[PDB]
């Protein structure tokens, strides 16, 4: 009858020429693309490989995706045959506690962010942890003698930023200090927690208690220990690293007969992941909230016949289907934000490839030719917001002085007790804290908090806005205003301009810290 080479449920001609699933009279229907009918209904035109049961080389067939006959936890974007459906799990540390191995202990909040490798593949996801260096000396407060030994504990959560869920299994994670000082190896207890970590979710959920390394109720748990020297480095760096593998267990599959979705013991993520990574182009995009979001699109590999049987994929197209971009009036953009607001970064090979395309395109500006740029399997593309400044892990650590001020340009209820203003969430990320100095009329300055670790005065308010507190480091007392004439200045510090330790001297002053003016008022009615 009609050829279905891969036996996915879709005829060959449809997969190559275009198709879509429509519903008429509450009945699913797989039809050839018909512009005059389907565009109206806002339906999506699909194309996929006739010789791949799963064009993206994932556990779900092209048919199961486009039709909805699939694990409902598979992300919407991954319901597209050309977008891979797989988990991307990494560990999130919230708080950490250090003690002397038997008060006098330390409890700091940690800000861990998922990172990306300038390196190629690694078959692993990783995150970096940043420890709060604000006020509460460490080794001192802990009374750590050179012959001592430090104990470590923390609260963590697993987070899936992928397009497919995980069942009954958690990845093994390595807690690394420095370049390769593996402190601990974190595995899941019970071997089978019997839970689920769906895409875009945390485990345990944010409304539940976090997971603790060496739990209180548990006693046999292997304690995490550092020596005197390691601890010193830990204090010198205020930074750890989680290396989480890709052991995600078995896959929940769909069963036509009764529509049941059970875990297929004969289907494992371990045997499918390495195929995705070799047949897909990877695009990473921090546009939603300065968080690195990794996506993979089925791209042709010219040297591989089976792969050259895939639909042709352009950079513009990938962005639409993967990250939900759109061109309302000819202008490709991500929720009002034009592409021109984002940088493109490639690994070596993919970069060379692009250049050859541009050259062969007689084009110099890529932004004017995204619909002409072909993607190929194994390409690695990174797309970031131009405004912000990223570290070597592509994490927003700051921005331009002008843009910062622009966000505080919207004051609300100023006082002598503190300031309050609705401030863009995007910027708060790159901010470590604020400092406020009292300036004389002749040009004198008296910072109210002259320490590198007294910047934590900013606090989110559940009303949906931030509130700066002068009292916090002013002996719980409102900022005294001698003469309402000379202005009292206030301004924030960027995370990359943030100092975490006393200078070589031992100087704990605030001076030297690069800052960005965001507030100044004479003091009187103005103040």
């Amino acid at each position: 009858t009609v050829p279905d080479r891969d036996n996915d449920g879709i005829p060959d001609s449809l997969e190559v020429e275009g198709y879509t699933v429509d519903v008429k009279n509450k009945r699913t229907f797989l039809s050839p693309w018909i512009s005059n009918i389907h565009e109206k209904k806002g339906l999506t035109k699909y194309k996929s490989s006739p010789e791949k049961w799963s064009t993206a080389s994932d556990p779900y067939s092209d048919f199961e995706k486009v039709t909805g006959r699939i694990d409902k936890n598979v992300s919407p974007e991954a319901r597209h045959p050309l977008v891979a459906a797989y988990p991307i799990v990494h560990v999130d540390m919230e708080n950490i506690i250090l003690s002397k191995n038997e008060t006098r202990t330390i409890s700091k909040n940690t800000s861990t962010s998922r990172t990306h490798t300038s390196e190629p593949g690694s078959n692993s996801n990783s995150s970096t942890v940043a420890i709060d260096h604000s006020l509460s000396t460490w080794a001192e407060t802990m009374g750590l003698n050179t012959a001592d030994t430090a104990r470590l504990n923390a609260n963590i959560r697993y987070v899936n930023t992928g397009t497919a869920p995980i069942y009954n299994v958690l990845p093994t994670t390595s807690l690394v200090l420095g370049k390769n000082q593996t402190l601990a190896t974190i595995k899941a207890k019970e071997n089978q927690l019997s839970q689920i970590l769906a895409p875009n979710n945390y485990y345990p959920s944010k409304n539940l208690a976090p997971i603790a390394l060496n739990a209180q109720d548990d006693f046999s748990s292997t304690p995490i220990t550092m020596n005197y020297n390691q601890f010193l480095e830990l204090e010198k760096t205020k930074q750890l690293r989680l290396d989480t593998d890709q052991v995600y267990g078995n896959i929940a599959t769909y069963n036509f007969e009764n529509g049941r979705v059970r875990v297929d013991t004969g289907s494992n993520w371990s045997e499918v992941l390495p195929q995705i990574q070799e047949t897909t182009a990877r695009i990473i995009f921090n546009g939603k909230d300065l968080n690195l979001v990794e996506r993979r699109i089925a791209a042709v590999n010219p040297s591989d016949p089976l792969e050259t049987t895939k639909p042709d994929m352009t950079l513009k197209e990938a962005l639409k289907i993967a990250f939900g971009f759109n061109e309302p009036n000819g202008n490709l953009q991500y929720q009002g934000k034009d592409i021109t607001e984002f940088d493109f970064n490639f690994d070596q090979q993919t970069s060379q490839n692009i250049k050859n395309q541009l050259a062969e395109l007689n084009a110099t500006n890529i932004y004017t030719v995204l619909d002409k740029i072909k993607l190929n399997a194994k390409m690695n593309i990174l797309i970031r917001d131009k405004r912000f400044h990223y570290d070597r892990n592509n994490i927003a650590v700051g921005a331009d002085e002008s843009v910062v001020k622009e966000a505080h340009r919207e004051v609300i209820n100023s006082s002598t007790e503190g300031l309050l203003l609705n401030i863009d969430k995007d910027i708060r990320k790159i901010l470590s804290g604020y400092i406020v100095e009292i300036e004389d009329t002749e040009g004198l300055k008296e910072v109210i908090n002259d320490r590198y670790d007294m910047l934590n005065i900013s606090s989110l308010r559940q009303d949906g806005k931030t509130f700066i507190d002068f009292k916090k480091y002013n002996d719980k007392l409102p900022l005294y205003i001698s003469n309402p004439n000379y202005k009292v200045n206030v301004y924030a510090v960027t995370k990359e301009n943030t100092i975490i330790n006393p200078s070589e001297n031992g100087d704990t002053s605030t001076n030297g810290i690069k800052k960005i003016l965001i507030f100044s008022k004479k003091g009187y009615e103005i103040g």
Partner: protein, 222 residues
Amino acid sequence: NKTQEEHLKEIMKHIVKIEVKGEEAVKKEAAEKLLEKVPSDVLEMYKAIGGKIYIVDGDITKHISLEALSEDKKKIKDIYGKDALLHEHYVYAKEGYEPVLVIQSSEDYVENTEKALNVYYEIGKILSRDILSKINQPYQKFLDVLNTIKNASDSDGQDLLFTNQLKEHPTDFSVEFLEQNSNEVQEVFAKAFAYYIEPQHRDVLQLYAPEAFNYMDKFNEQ
């Protein structure tokens, strides 16, 4: 539960070829396969009125049986209503005392359903006029089904078969429109024809335009 070997035979049967007739031959063979879908019921009636079927190569405009006739008609629209330049197409019927159909030759006539659909479309015209225009009257038989499409829930049917005109004609269809406009009324017949003929586009018709299919089904077999 097909074993792995069994699956292998299936795919190899699709993938492995041996004897090859050579490009040119394949081109012709492909075209033939198309016509095989069309019921001879109409083919014989085409040659009966002096019908000629050509399968040329390259630009069709560059033909002997068809030279430079009215550059105007060299601007065309596909079965979807989108414009197209004739010299780039692959099919065309000829309106004259000596009707004649000519098409390009391609390997795509067994891969691309889009193309075949457009050629069955053209054939639809040939019938709707060059074989129907004659003894069409009273013609009410088809006239009545075309109405059901105009006025009825779901615009789909008329978004599929109707032009950007008949759709917007507020009033119901007058039994005089077919006279003033035998042109449009037969374009529809041509389209509905194409969809019913193209095996994979058939069910589509049955779904979006149940009536158009309900008729075209009876029509041919009886």
